[PDB]
């Protein structure tokens, strides 16, 4: 209820400065039980927004970039605090989130959902640090949509190995076939 009725407030602000201030503040209002807030935000709210076709109009550009920043910050902060054990709920919800990212990137329809997912990817690249080595928790069947974030690049090269699971045998091939295009 908390995350829903605060993101619903963030998504109504029309001016850029206010949405950025709003997410900067929501990150700290959320630090209360950051872990569960991350679980619920990512799992139940971002798929709900990305799979409605009528909540899509809220993800427009001034409020959408803010929500993308907040989601990336939440994901990084929930993981960085205290093969990978898929029994940990955070890992399962991150896997589901990136699977949905994939299905949205490579889908017949494009719209504000595609732009929001690209923005989430761009931000996850920007604030990428040593903690989230593999685009934190890109699942093994993933890196298959690195090809899609290349075909729909709107983004410089060399961010894709930052995405890519480097230091891996299959990672070599996937990153190479990828950058071959862009």
């Amino acid at each position: 209820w908390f995350c829903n009725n605060l993101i619903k407030e963030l998504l109504k602000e029309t001016r850029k400065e206010h949405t950025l201030r709003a997410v900067e503040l929501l990150y700290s209002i959320f630090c209360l039980d950051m872990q569960q807030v991350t679980l619920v935000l990512l799992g139940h709210i971002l798929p709900g927004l990305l799979t409605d076709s009528s909540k899509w109009h809220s993800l427009m550009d001034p409020p959408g970039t803010a929500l993308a920043k907040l989601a990336v910050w939440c994901a990084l902060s929930s993981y960085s605090s205290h093969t990978v054990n898929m029994r940990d709920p955070l890992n399962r919800v991150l896997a589901n989130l990136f699977l949905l990212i994939s299905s949205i990137l490579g889908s017949r329809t494009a719209g504000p959902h595609t732009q929001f997912v690209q923005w989430f990817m761009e931000e996850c690249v920007d604030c990428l640090e040593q903690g989230g080595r593999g685009s934190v928790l890109q699942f093994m069947p993933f890196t298959t949509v690195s090809e899609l974030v290349k075909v729909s690049a709107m983004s410089s090269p060399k961010v894709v190995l930052a995405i890519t699971d480097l230091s891996l045998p299959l990672g070599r091939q996937v990153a190479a076939k990828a950058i071959a295009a862009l």
């Binding site: 400065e17 950025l20 201030r21 900067e24 503040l25 990150y27 700290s28 209002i29 630090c31 209360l32 990336v72 910050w73 990084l76 902060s77 960085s80 605090s81 920007d126 604030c127 990428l128 640090e129 410089s156 090269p157 060399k158 894709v160 190995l161 930052a162 890519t164 480097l166 230091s167 990672g171 070599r172 091939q173 990153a175 190479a176 076939k177 990828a178 950058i179 071959a180 295009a181 862009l182």
Partner: protein, 360 residues
Amino acid sequence: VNLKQAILQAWKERWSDYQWAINMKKFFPKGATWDILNLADALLEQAMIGPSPNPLILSYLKYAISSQMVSYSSVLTAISKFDDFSRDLCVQALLDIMDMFCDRLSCHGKAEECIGLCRALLSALHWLLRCTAASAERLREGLEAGTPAAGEKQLAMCLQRLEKTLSSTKNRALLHIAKLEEASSWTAIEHSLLKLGEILANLSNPQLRSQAEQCGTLIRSIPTMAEQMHKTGFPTVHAVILLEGTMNLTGETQSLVEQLTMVKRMQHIPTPLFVLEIWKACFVGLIESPEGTEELKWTAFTFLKIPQVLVKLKKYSDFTEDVNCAFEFLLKLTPLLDKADQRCNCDCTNFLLQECGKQG
């Protein structure tokens, strides 16, 4: 041999580029497969033999490159295995080869040999630096004997690099992804660069030295992996400290240090503004505080605990200059500081200054 013998069948039978193609198609049937090592190798040394590269044999190589015929990778390897002992213009011929090709590296197709392609690009970078070293030795022995004419021309060949994709996870990131199997080649980029440290600073050509240092930094930009005019101020750090004061005072210093480093990284907070916001939040919580038994909490927080947090932060990074700049920012806020002086009943910044100075 027999495959070499076709290039001879064009030794001075200046057949053409196109008739060369059709001849190759006839002679060695393309039924199963080819370009394992055949065309690039069979063409290279039969062209570069002796002083001048055979213009027509080199012409067919230019062709096969342009028509996406051989590999775009076996060509790089063939140029890599070239052994600069040819002190003559032939190196310039191979540079002319690299010209039209290097800027665009498609390698699209089976694309499994794309890791092979970055392997080849690494070997070609090694060959490039080796040619640079040979041409710089020619520069030096010419400063001894002969005025340079074409010594630095391979610098433009390095400027053919230095674009993103030419040095992106095509070259750089797959350079290390490749040293995962060819760590000797990472040591190779280090090693050629070691002797480059010897053969770089001695040259007296200023502009060329600057471009060479640029390429050398882009090599040192193999570790490669914004918003300078951060205008609005940083409110999330404010709220993070303020929450850590209100709800959870007794929480370990390590937890708050962890939370605060994260936010600084994610939002790229300049270190002067970080401490400004921490100290502003502490004071604001102190001023807007309940009267009796919560005020001690804010003051204990502000004056004892945040100092140890900043000490641990100093450990986790010129931090003295930085906190000095932060306090200079803070002193230039007379309203907040004077309300603090009012409420705390004593000079709230004289004390904070002495207390912060008492630590590291």
